[PDB]
Design a protein around this nucleic acid. Structure first.
Lengths: 50, 208, 121, 125, 155
RNA sequence: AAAACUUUCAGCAACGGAUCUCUUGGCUCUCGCAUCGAUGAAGAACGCAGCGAAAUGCGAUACGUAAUGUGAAUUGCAGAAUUCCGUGAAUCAUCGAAUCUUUGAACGCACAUUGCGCCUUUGGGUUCUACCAAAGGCAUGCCUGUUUGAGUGUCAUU
RNA sequence: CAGAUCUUGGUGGAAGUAGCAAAUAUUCAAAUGAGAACUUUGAAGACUGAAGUGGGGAAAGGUUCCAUGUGAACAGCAGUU
RNA sequence: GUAGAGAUUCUGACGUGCAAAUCGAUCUUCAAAUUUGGGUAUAGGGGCGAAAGACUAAUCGAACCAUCUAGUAGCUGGUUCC
RNA sequence: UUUCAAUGGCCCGUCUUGAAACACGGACCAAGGAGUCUAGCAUCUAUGCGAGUGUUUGGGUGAAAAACCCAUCCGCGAAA
RNA sequence: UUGACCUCAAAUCAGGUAGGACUACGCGCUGAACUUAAGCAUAUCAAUAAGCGCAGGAAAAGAAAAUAACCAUGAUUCCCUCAGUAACGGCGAGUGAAGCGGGAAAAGCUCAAAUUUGAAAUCUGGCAACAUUUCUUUUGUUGUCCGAGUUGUAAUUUCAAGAAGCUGCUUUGAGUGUAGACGAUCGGUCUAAGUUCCUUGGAACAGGACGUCAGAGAGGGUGAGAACCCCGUCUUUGGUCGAUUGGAUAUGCCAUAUAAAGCGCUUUCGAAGAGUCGAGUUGUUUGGGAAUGCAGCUCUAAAUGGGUGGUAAAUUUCAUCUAAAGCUAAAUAUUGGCGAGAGACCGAUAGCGAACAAGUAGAGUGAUCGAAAGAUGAAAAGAACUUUGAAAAGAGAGUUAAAUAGUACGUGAAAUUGCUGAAAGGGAAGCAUUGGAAAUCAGUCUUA
C-alpha cells in the first residue's frame, strides 16, 4: 500500500529491475544460450509473495 | 548400479478410486507440470525401474586352481599346433617353425625398429600387418565409454628375463608381451578360442 | 596508468592528495557518462577506478606495515596482525608444550633410547 | 599407451579440458608448425601462433593463401588472416577463421621473450 | 509355502540388512595399501628387522597344545636368565610380556635359547659413532636388513 | 444412374516429434587427502561492468586491488594499445598482502520500526554553551589474575 | 507389449457444434488509418441519481501512474485503443 | 420498516454455471445475547463449540506437511517373440 | 496390388460351469512398461581333482582392481 | 579502633574461552509403529526410523578386578573361523554370541595412596631484556616484582613392582651453529617422426602410391576413420633451476655429571582408588538361561581382602585377575566435503529432481512441493537486390555440398489432416477361400 516499509521498498525496487527484457547485444555473443528472459513477471499473473 | 534413491526422492500417494484415474501414486500440490503425475513405478516416467541394479551382484566367479592350470596347459598345447593357429587367425603360412623359439639376444633388444626387423626376418610381420589393417572404430555405445577402437590380436612374445624386450615390442600393434612364469589364459586363448601364435625366447622355452 | 611501485616510493600525504585528485577525476568522468560521453571517456572510467584501488591498497600496506613494526617484539599484537590459519590450529597445543615431558620420561629416554641395530644373516 | 596415473584417457574429460581451457591454455593449444626454412634454422618443430606472424595456409578451401595474422581469436580457436575474407550478401567482407594446425609459420614476430622461448625449447636463434 | 524337498529355511533376513551390506571391491586396493605401508615402514626403520622377534609358546587347549606358535613377548624371567636387562630389551627390539610366566623349565629353556641366538646374531650400532660401549658392535659396515623368520623360525 | 460426401490405397504437402547418431551430463567402483566458526562461519539481503535481466565472480579498493608466473590480448560492438631495443595485454593462470556493504551463532536495546540509546577521542563550519560528522567501543556464561568492596563468618590488637 | 480406469507426450470424431442472452441504449457527421459497430472530437439520446457507476482513504497489490511508440501475443468479436 | 445482518419458500434461474454455492423474487431480523475492522490468546486425540460431531484456510466421526514406506494384500487388474 | 461376385466369418483381452453379451477394461498413435537380484536349500546336468577337497581371510609377485605363485589354519568329507 | 583470614560479590577490570554450521563414518541419550507371527496381547520389526546432545580425521576401545582347566595363553581393534553354533524363544514365528585357531597391525605406560623437612626444590601473570619464525603474523629463554601454593606444587614410587638399605661394575645433553653429501617433497621448465604425390569431396583426417618415427600405434583437437598438422603420450620414480623438509655425517661451540640411571643379592618392610563392590528389589536390556549389562530406590562390607571360573544356596579347597583414577599410534569405518583415476553402467520419457539460466520457473499462509526444456552449418556465408502487399510475408534472386539445413532450423516415424490420381459405396465396415477384371512385376528362355 501507500504505507510501506523500507525493506519492502528495497524488495520491490530489485524485483522491478529484474523484470526487464534482455539487452540485444547479449544475444550476439558467441555461445550464447540466452534468447529471452526466463524470469519475466506481470503484476496480475504471478505475485511476488513478499 | 543405479542410485539407491532414484525414483523415490519425490513425495507421492495414491489418490484412491473415484477420480477416473489409475490408483498409482501421484505427485501432490500444484502450479507445475509435475503436479498430478504418477510416480513410484517401473511403468512411470521419472519413476524407479523394476529391480534396481545393486553393487552386491556377483561380478567375480571363483575357479578351481587345478582347472585353471588345466586350461593353461591346454592353451599352451594348442599354441604348439600349427593348424589351430591358422584357424585362430594368425598369418603363419610362412613361419619357419611352430613352436617358434628365438635366441636369447632378443631379450636385450632396445629399439622397436630392431623388434620389427626381427619379426620380418622370422616372417611373423604378416600378423602385425593384419592387426594394423584391421584397426577400426567400435560399433555402438562402446566408443562413448573409452572403448574407441578395435583390432585383431598379433603374436604373443614370451620372455624369461626383461632386459628391454618389453619396451622394444610393446608399441607394435597387436603384439602382447608376457613373462613365462605368469602365463595368462586371457592372452593364451583370447576370446575363448585356442591356438594363439606364440614366439618363445630360448630361456623361456627351457623354463617351460 | 599509475604503477604500484612508483606509488610505493611516495609519502602518505602525497598518496592522500593523489587519491583526492583521482576521486575528482572519477566524479567528472561519471558526470560525462550521465550527460552522454564518448567511448574514450567511458574506458577511462575503469582505469581511474583501478588507480584509486591501487592508491588505497598502497596506503593500507604502509599503514599495516607501520603497525607491524610498532607491535613487533610485543607479547600482544592486534588480532588482524596475528595469524589466521584456522580456528582449530590457533587453539591447538604448540610444539613446545606438546614436546614437554616429565623428569621421569626424560631420564628414561636419556638412558634407554631406541637403539639402532641389525641382524646377521 | 599411457602409463601415468595422473593423465586422463577419458574421452569425456579430455573434451571438457579442451573446451573449458582458459585463455592461457588456449595459447598453447593453438600451435602451428614451422616451415622448412625456419625449422632448419631455429631447430624448433612448432611454436604457438601470435599476432602479426607471417604464415601460409596449408589446408582447406584457402589452400596456398598468404597473409599475416591479424588476430588470434582464441575463444573460438580460429586465426584471422589478412586478405582472407569472404563476401557477404550485402557486399561486406567477413574474415574467415582458420585453425592453427592448418597453417604454417613462414616468418615469426621476433621479440626478446620469443627469442628466450626459442632458446629454451632446445632451439637456436 | 513350505512344500519342497530340502531343509527348512533359516534366512536371518528380517531386519533392514541392505543398508549394512559390506562389499569387498577394495580388496586389492586394501592389499596394495598395506604393502606400500609395509615397504614404507621397512625403509623407515632399516637396518633393524621389520618384525620383532617373538617367543615360541604352546596354545592353551587340548586341541592345540601339541603345536608350537609365536607368543607376544619374552617373560621377565626368560630375559633375566638370558642376561638381558628389562629396560635394554625394549630398546634393541626384544618384546617383553610381563603377564606371561614360565611354569616349566622346558618353555624357559626354549625361549632362553631363542634370545641367546638373537643376541649372538645381533649387531648393535653405537650410540655415538666410533665408541663402542659394553654391548656394542665394533664393525657395523656389514649390517643389512634381514628377516627374523630367516634367522630363527618357530620349530 | 454423374458429382459431392464416406471409406481404402499411392504420391506430395502438413501436423507431430518418434527413430537413428552424438554427449563439457549423470550413476557406480577404486585411490589419495583432513581443511569451518566470535581473527565473525554456513546461509541470507542488497549492490558492483561503457553498453546486463539471469548464471559466474566480486564487495563502495565491488565481473575486482597487491604479488608471482606466462607473454600480446579482449571481442557482440565500442574502445584503447604494448611499440615490436617490455616491468607488460589478458573475462589468463596462480595466489603467501589487503579489501570484504547490510546481515546471520550475531554481540548496546530492538526490528512487518535504515527504529532507540550510551561511552571515549577527533574534526567541520559565514553559524561555535548550539548543531553536525568521523573514528574506536558497550552481549551472556565461564576460567586465571587485578582492583574495589560486603558480612551480628573466624580472631588478634586494646 | 494391444490391453493394466497403465505412464508421459501428441492427436482425433463429436464440431465450425454447445456457446459468446444479467447490469434499459444507442445514433449521426468528421478526423485518424491500408483497414472503424468498438479509437478521438462534436451533436443527439439515455443511465448511475449524493446508502452513486461521484470524490477519498485503510488492508492487499507493486509501477498497474505519466508521456511517447507499437509487427505480432493478450483484451473468449474487433481494434488505429 | 431502509442501510446493515441473515437465508424461509419458489424445491424458480443456473446446474461441463457469473459462481467448486451464485442470481432473481418472496421472506426473517434491524438499537442489541446487535453488526464489524485491526491487535491479541487458545493447535491435532488438541483447540473451540447458545451443541450441529459443528468449526479448526474449498481438508474434520480426528486438519495439513514430510518421513518410517516400495507399510501390508487368502482380494482386483495387467504380465511383452515363434 | 486393388475391386467385384459366390461362400463362410459376432469384439477383442478378462474372471467364469458358461461372454457376441444388456459382465469388466479398451477413442486413437508413438516411446516407456511387469518373475529381477542376493543369502541359502533340493533334485538334475557339466567340469576339475578324488579319501580327500577348497588359491583369492591374508602373503608373495605382477607397472597393476587382472594374471601368476605360496605358508599355516579352517570349512565340508573320511563314524556312528 | 586498626588489621589478618574465610566466604561472597562488582568492573566496557588484564588476558582468554564457549556457542553456530557440516554430520557419510564416530560416541551417547531418547525411542516408535507399519510389518512377521497367515488372527493377536509376549515376541518380531528393533536395542531400528524420527527427536536430542558431543567429537575427529578417524572416532571408539586399549595395557586385564581377561581367558581358560592346557605342555596353559596374554592390552585394544579389524578380518577369516568358531557358527546359524551354545543359548534364547505363545521353545511358536523367529532370534543368537564367546574362548581357542589363522591373519592384518603391534607400543607401551601415567597418577592417588610416602617426611624435600638440612631448607616449595614447583607454577601463573605483570614489567624489562634478549631470541626464534610456514610467520614483522610463530614459539620461547633469562632476569625481576606481584601472586598461586603447606587444606600440598616438584623430585621419588605404580604392583610388571618398588622403597629403604647394603658393594660394584656398566651406562649419560630435552643441547645450538656450520659445511657438504645422501633422501623425500609439492612446481616452473625441456621432448621422435609426411602434412610428399594421384583419385574422390564443399573440406582429405578417406582410398591408392612413396616414406618416417616408435621407451611415443593412450586419449583429445583440427571442415569425414590423423602414430607422423596440433596438444599430448613414452622416456619420467628424470634432466634442469629454484624450493621446502628428513635421518645420518663431517665439524665448531655451550655443555659444573660432586651428579643421574640400569643391574646384584636383602631373614626386611611394602602405603594400592567407598554410598564404591556387593545384596535385595523394580524397570530396561542380552544368546546369557533361580539376571548379561545398565539405571532408579532400600541396605551397605572388607583386608590375603575383593572380583570372575556362564544352575540357585551353605561350607571347604583350587586356579585366575587386582575394580571403584588416567593417557596411548598402527591395523578399522567413511551415501559428507576436497582432489584424482577408471568402468562389459545410462545415452535426453534413460542417467541425479536438474546434460540447458535446476532446487530454477511455478504452487501453497506455512511446513513444504517442484517441473518442462539438448542438436542449422565446416564457417552466419542468418538470404544484398528487384517486384506484389498497409504489414506479416510471397514470388524472383542470392548464400551453401545441401535451404529436401532458413533460427517454427540434423534425421523428421505413427496418430491426425489438406490436395491430387485410382476405385468402391441401396441401413456399418474390416476378414478368410476361389477365380474374373484392371494395374503392376519377375523368373524363365534367348543358348550350350
Amino acid at each position: 500500500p501507500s504505507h510501506k516499509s523500507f525493506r519492502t521498498k528495497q524488495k520491490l525496487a530489485k524485483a522491478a529491475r529484474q523484470n526487464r527484457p534482455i539487452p540485444q547485444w547479449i544475444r550476439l555473443r558467441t555461445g550464447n544460450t540466452v534468447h529471452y528472459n526466463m524470469k519475466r513477471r506481470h503484476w496480475r499473473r504471478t505475485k511476488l509473495n513478499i | 548400479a543405479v542410485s539407491e534413491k532414484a525414483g523415490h526422492q519425490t513425495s507421492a500417494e495414491s489418490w484412491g478410486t473415484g477420480r477416473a484415474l489409475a490408483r498409482i501414486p501421484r505427485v501432490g500440490g500444484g502450479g507445475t507440470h509435475r503436479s498430478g503425475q504418477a510416480a513410484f513405478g517401473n511403468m512411470c516416467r521419472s519413476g524407479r525401474m523394476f529391480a534396481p541394479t545393486k553393487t552386491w551382484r556377483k561380478w567375480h566367479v571363483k575357479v578351481n586352481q587345478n582347472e585353471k592350470r588345466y586350461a593353461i596347459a591346454s592353451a599352451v598345447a594348442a599354441s604348439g599346433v600349427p593348424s589351430l593357429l591358422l584357424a585362430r587367425g594368425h598369418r603363419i603360412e610362412e613361419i619357419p617353425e611352430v613352436p617358434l623359439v628365438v635366441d636369447d639376444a632378443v631379450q636385450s633388444f632396445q629399439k622397436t625398429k630392431e623388434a620389427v626387423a626381427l619379426l620380418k626376418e622370422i616372417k611373423a610381420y604378416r600378423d602385425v600387418i593384419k592387426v594394423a589393417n584391421s584397426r577400426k572404430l567400435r560399433a555402438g555405445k562402446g566408443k562413448l565409454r573409452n572403448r574407441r577402437h578395435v583390432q585383431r590380436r598379433g603374436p604373443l612374445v614370451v620372455f624369461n628375463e626383461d632386459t628391454g624386450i618389453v619396451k622394444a615390442f610393446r608399441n607394435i600393434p597387436g603384439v602382447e608381451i608376457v613373462n613365462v612364469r605368469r602365463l595368462n589364459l586371457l592372452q593364451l586363448a583370447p576370446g575363448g578360442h585356442l591356438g594363439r601364435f606364440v614366439i618363445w625366447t630360448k630361456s623361456a622355452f627351457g623354463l617351460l | 596508468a599509475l604503477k604500484t611501485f612508483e606509488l610505493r616510493k611516495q609519502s602518505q600525504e602525497n598518496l592522500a592528495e593523489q587519491l583526492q585528485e583521482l576521486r575528482q577525476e572519477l566524479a567528472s568522468l561519471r558526470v560525462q557518462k550521465i550527460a552522454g560521453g564518448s567511448g574514450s571517456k567511458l574506458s577511462k572510467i575503469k582505469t581511474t577506478r583501478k588507480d584509486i584501488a591501487r592508491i588505497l591498497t598502497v596506503i593500507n600496506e604502509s599503514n599495516r606495515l607501520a603497525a607491524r613494526e610498532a607491535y613487533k617484539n610485543k607479547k600482544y599484537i592486534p588480532l588482524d596482525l596475528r595469524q589466521k590459519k584456522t580456528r582449530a590450529i590457533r587453539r591447538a597445543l604448540t610444539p613446545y608444550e606438546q614436546s614437554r615431558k616429565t623428569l621421569k620420561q626424560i631420564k628414561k629416554e636419556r638412558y634407554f633410547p631406541l637403539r639402532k641395530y641389525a641382524l646377521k644373516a | 599407451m599411457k602409463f601415468s596415473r595422473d593423465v586422463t584417457s577419458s574421452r569425456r574429460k579430455q573434451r571438457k579440458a579442451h573446451f573449458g581451457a582458459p585463455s592461457s591454455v588456449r595459447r598453447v593449444l593453438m600451435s602451428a608448425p614451422l616451415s622448412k626454412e625456419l625449422r632448419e634454422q631455429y631447430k624448433i618443430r612448432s611454436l604457438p601462433v601470435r599476432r602479426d606472424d607471417q604464415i601460409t595456409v596449408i589446408r582447406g578451401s584457402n589452400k596456398g593463401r598468404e597473409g599475416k595474422i591479424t588476430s588470434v581469436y582464441r575463444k573460438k580457436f580460429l586465426l584471422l588472416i589478412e586478405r582472407v575474407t569472404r563476401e557477404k550478401a550485402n557486399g561486406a567482407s567477413a574474415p574467415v577463421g582458420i585453425d592453427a594446425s592448418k597453417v604454417v609459420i613462414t616468418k615469426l614476430h621476433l621479440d626478446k621473450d620469443r627469442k628466450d622461448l626459442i632458446v629454451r625449447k632446445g632451439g637456436k636463434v | 509355502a513350505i512344500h519342497v524337498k530340502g531343509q527348512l529355511p533359516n534366512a536371518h533376513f528380517h531386519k533392514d540388512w541392505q543398508r549394512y551390506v559390506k562389499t569387498w571391491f577394495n580388496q586389492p586396493g586394501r592389499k596394495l595399501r598395506r604393502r606400500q605401508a609395509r615397504q614404507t615402514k621397512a625403509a623407515k626403520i632399516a637396518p633393524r628387522p621389520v618384525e620383532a622377534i617373538r617367543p615360541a609358546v604352546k596354545p592353551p587347549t587340548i586341541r592345540y597344545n601339541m603345536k608350537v606358535r609365536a607368543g607376544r613377548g619374552f617373560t621377565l624371567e626368560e630375559l633375566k636368565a638370558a642376561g638381558v636387562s628389562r629396560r635394554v630389551a625394549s630398546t634393541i627390539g626384544i618384546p617383553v610380556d610381563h603377564r606371561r610366566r614360565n611354569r616349566s623349565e622346558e618353555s624357559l629353556q626354549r625361549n632362553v635359547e631363542r634370545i641367546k641366538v638373537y643376541l649372538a646374531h645381533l649387531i648393535v650400532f653405537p650410540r655415538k659413532a666410533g665408541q663402542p660401549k659394553k654391548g656394542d658392535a665394533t664393525d657395523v659396515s656389514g649390517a643389512e636388513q634381514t628377516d627374523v623368520a630367516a634367522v630363527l623360525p618357530i620349530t
